[PDB]
Design a protein around this nucleic acid. Structure first.
Lengths: 113, 138, 86, 53, 122
RNA sequence: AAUCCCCCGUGCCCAUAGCGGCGUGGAACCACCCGUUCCCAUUCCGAACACGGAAGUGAAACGCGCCAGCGCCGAUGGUACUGGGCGGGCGACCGCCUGGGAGAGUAGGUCGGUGCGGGGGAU
RNA sequence: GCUGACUGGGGCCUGUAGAGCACUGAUAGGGCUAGGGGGCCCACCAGCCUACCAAACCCUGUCAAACUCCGAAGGGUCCCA
RNA sequence: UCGCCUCCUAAAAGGUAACGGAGGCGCCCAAAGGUCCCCUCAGGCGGGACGGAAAUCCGCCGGAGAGCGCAAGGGUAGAAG
RNA sequence: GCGGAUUUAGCUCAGUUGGGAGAGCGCCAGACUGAAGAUCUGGAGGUCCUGUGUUCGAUCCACAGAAUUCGCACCA
């Protein structure tokens, strides 16, 4: 096959799905413990720590809120940066109520999503 | 160097009906042997014969290993005259690639065999070269 | 009123695929590269493939057209240097 | 086209009468009388299209 | 680290499958993890040619529920030798197959670095 | 604050990263974990996807490190093929002159290297 | 009106000749092996052994225009001369 | 024997006859269509029901060799699936 | 050498989902007769040509290759 293909679980490709364009893989990356999200925007882009459950201490609000806010937040540190409308990257999972969470994160953030 | 149709389509994948590869015997040293240097769709039958010929003149030790095999085929006459050629098949042969490792007479000391191949030699069809391998023959 | 057998006798016919434009030539939102028609073009150039490496054709405008799995559904952009402020 | 009383019969549809129609080929094959899909008569836009003919 | 090797429930399968509609219902009552799996072939050894028929039934039960069963039914069984086999697994009754699980075990499912299960851990 | 260890998401380089063999690590990390009213969810169980949390643990998927068995890569000189130019056989074909010059064949090589960020860890 | 065959350079294509075996189909000496054998308890025995046929995997070996993990010789084309 | 689809032949762009090689088509599929959601093959090995080729399930191994309506070639699981 | 068609139980014959096969005649047992025969009783019997191939599977579908019988064949 190909590396990722003999392996599995992944679909980094639907990642590509978005890669086409629409601005940035506002990518939610999750490992229950926490979540951390970055921004891969086309052109061998980069990022800007917009959201992580450790850039501001792993509270104790667990999922629900945790994601709510860290999201809103990322959205904002970001607009500070100067973006506008970003594009949703389901790092993985079926936009799990968790992702859902990060998601409204950008949502309310204002982060157009 | 024209050749066969499609080895599953004209005439492709046989058993070239012949007379196998090893008769003769063992040993670690003396390479006693036969190779040639002509170029040709080595004559199935012909060959087969020649070869078993040698066998005939001998019977045992002295590697009568024989490194040849007819695997493609000739064609001609079957239908209306001379213009449009459908295709009758005959002649299974192999490209004797202008010299190469033909058939061996391998063993420590059994000139009986050597001569024998010789025989097989005179036999064969395109002149062929009579010879020795990596050390000589004994 | 019919056809026969045991007479393969059957020519075939034409086609005309290609590497039309070839890599690194005056780019022009046009039939990019071809070996597979109902193509779905892509961005600037391509270089993924069943061999490894990658292709850069120093020419870009909107986009080009591909070859179903041959060549390479471009996407790894390269608008090329000659694409800076006039 | 090639009128084939074979499982291949030409047919078209109407926009509730958005007015005229549009082009389709079909098969008794499965589902007989059945034939509904939506379109856009010169009439306004969209509309319920029944296909039978 | 004996804190390893020494086991922990990993897959028990209970079933049946006649070339044939509800017997599997009987299953149902017996357990709680359905198993509609099509069976095959093409000949008459039981008049089984229809190459394509729902006819294989398999109530998968690992751990938990499989515990309810290992318990409830382990009594009606009666052999306890032989029907023991190699890869650390065994089977008996009108369609029962269980699989031991030494600690190397799990590695085997990985799509990645799928270690060919070292016949020394299992 | 803008020096190195480290893990974490993670990106380029399509096996000099894969295999597997031993090993090391949990504080920190991560997973495994616990449990299942409600989100959402299995054509069957929330095994996977799941929501909510300690304790338990590094076993398992996991990260560096060691190992050449497989595996991958891979040269020098080196042969065939040949671009071109001219000679020898009625011959299938032989040869020479002038740039190009694969694989395979022993060296030998490798068990990643490298992007950006986030957590720490170095007053 | 320097834009042309051509030559130097530089990308970027083809993938015959060659060559090779893991894709495929050949194929020969061979070994492991199980299918047929085949000789032995007569033999539902499915137990025994073994010198003939074999599939398959292995080592030694080979051929291919409609095979190719390999890969030129060269021709192509844009541009720079 | 006259049209079209694939392969070789085309001497490596693209492209050439031949009464040269082989082989398919004058259909279909209202859902193999659109898109969103999830699945990761054949095959081999080992172990059990009705099963002693040839399933059903379970546990390993796997440049995908399965697969795609129909023919060849291309592709390619990241999937067309 | 070209064409068309054919090779099934001993013999003459039948089938186009292909899906899983006889028709009548022959052959062994049972009668009916003192007997045999004609005649009622039962039965037993097939690579559907060789090898392939497409096929879930096709002898009924395809491709070579045997024998079948038939057509054919001129021009000066």
């Amino acid at each position: 096959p190909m590396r990722r293909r003999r392996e599995a679980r992944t679909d980094y490709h639907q990642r590509l799905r978005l890669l086409k364009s629409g601005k940035p893989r506002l990518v939610a990356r999750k490992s229950n413990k926490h979540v951390r999200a970055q921004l891969v925007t086309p052109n061998g882009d980069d990022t800007l720590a917009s959201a992580h459950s450790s850039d501001l201490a792993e509270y104790g609000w667990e999922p629900t809120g945790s994601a709510y806010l860290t999201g809103l937040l990322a959205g904002l540190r970001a607009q500070e940066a100067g973006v506008e409308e970003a594009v949703l990257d389901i790092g993985l999972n079926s936009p799990t109520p968790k992702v859902f969470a990060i998601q409204e994160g950008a949502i309310d953030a204002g982060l157009d999503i | 160097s024209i050749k066969p149709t499609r080895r599953e389509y004209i005439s492709g994948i046989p058993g070239k009906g012949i007379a196998q590869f090893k008769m003769g015997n063992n040993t670690y040293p003396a390479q006693v042997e036969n190779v040639v240097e002509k170029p040709v769709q080595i004559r199935h039958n012909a060959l087969e014969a020649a070869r078993n010929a040698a066998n005939r003149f001998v019977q045992n030790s002295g590697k009568f290993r024989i490194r040849k095999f007819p695997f493609h085929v000739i064609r001609e006459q079957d239908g209306d005259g001379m213009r449009a050629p459908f295709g009758k098949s005959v002649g299974t042969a192999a490209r004797s690639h202008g010299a190469n490792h033909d058939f061996i007479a391998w063993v420590n000391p059994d000139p009986a065999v050597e001569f024998a191949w010789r025989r097989a030699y005179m036999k064969v069809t395109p002149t062929v070269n009579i010879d020795s391998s990596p050390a000589g023959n004994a | 009123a019919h056809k026969k057998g045991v007479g393969s006798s059957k020519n075939g016919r034409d086609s005309n695929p290609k590497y039309l434009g070839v890599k690194k030539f005056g780019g022009e939102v046009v039939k990019a590269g071809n070996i597979l028609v109902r193509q779905r073009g892509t961005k600037f150039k391509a270089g993924q493939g069943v061999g490894m490496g990658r292709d850069h054709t120093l020419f870009a405008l909107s986009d080009g057209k591909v070859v179903f799995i041959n060549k390479g559904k471009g996407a790894r952009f390269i608008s090329i240097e000659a694409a800076q402020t006039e | 086209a090639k009128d084939g009383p074979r499982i291949i019969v030409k047919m078209e549809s109407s926009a509730g009468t958005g007015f005229y129609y549009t082009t389709t080929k079909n098969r008794r094959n499965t589902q007989a009388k059945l034939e509904l899909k939506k379109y856009d008569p010169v009439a306004k836009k969209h509309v319920v299209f029944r296909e039978k003919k | 680290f004996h804190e390893m090797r020494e086991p922990r429930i990993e897959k028990v399968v209970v079933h049946m499958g006649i070339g044939h509609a509800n017997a599997e219902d009987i299953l149902g009552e017996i357990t709680g993890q359905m198993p509609v799996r099509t069976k095959a072939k093409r000949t008459v050894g039981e008049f089984d040619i229809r190459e394509g028929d729902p006819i294989g039934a398999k109530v998968t039960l690992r751990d938990e529920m499989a515990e309810e069963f290992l318990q409830t039914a382990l009594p009606l069984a009666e052999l306890a030798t032989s029907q023991f086999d190699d890869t650390g697994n065994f089977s008996f009754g009108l369609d029962v197959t269980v699989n031991l699980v030494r600690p190397g075990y799990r590695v085997a499912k990985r799509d990645k670095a799928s270690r060919s299960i070292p016949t020394k851990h299992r």
